[PDB]
Amino acid sequence: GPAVIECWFVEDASGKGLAKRPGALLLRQGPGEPPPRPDLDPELYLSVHDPAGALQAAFRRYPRGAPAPHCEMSRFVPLP
C-alpha cells in the first residue's frame, strides 16, 4: 500500500480556530534515511513504528489505484 500518508494536523489550542498544518506519516522507515521533507514541520513528520501491526497491515493490503485516505492528526491528553 502507500508508503506515506499525507495528514493534516489540527490545532487543539483555543484561539487558533481549527488551523490545519501539513504533515506526513511514513509507515515503513525502511533501510536508509527517510525521504527528506523540508516542506513539512519536523514534528508533524512521523516515522511510525507499530508493534501490534494493525495499522501496518491495514495499509499493506490497501487496494491499488484507490484515492488517498483522509488523515488528521491532533494532540491528545489522556483523561479518564
Partner: protein, 49 residues
C-alpha cells in the same frame, strides 16, 4: 523474483501441474489440467518483508 511449483504424487505417479516465475520473464512448462495459480507478491514496496 520467485518461483512457484505445484506437483502431484499418488500411487507411484507424479506430474508437474504448474510452474511459474513471477517477476521474471521466461518460458515455463505448460500448465496441466487447465490449472492456474494466483502467484504474485501482495505488494511491490521497495523494502521487505
Amino acid at each position: 523474483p520467485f518461483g512457484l511449483e505445484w506437483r502431484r504424487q499418488h500411487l507411484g505417479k507424479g506430474h508437474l501441474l504448474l510452474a511459474a516465475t513471477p517477476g521474471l520473464n521466461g518460458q515455463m512448462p505448460a500448465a496441466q489440467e487447465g490449472a492456474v495459480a494466483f502467484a504474485a507478491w501482495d505488494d511491490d514496496e521497495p523494502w521487505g518483508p
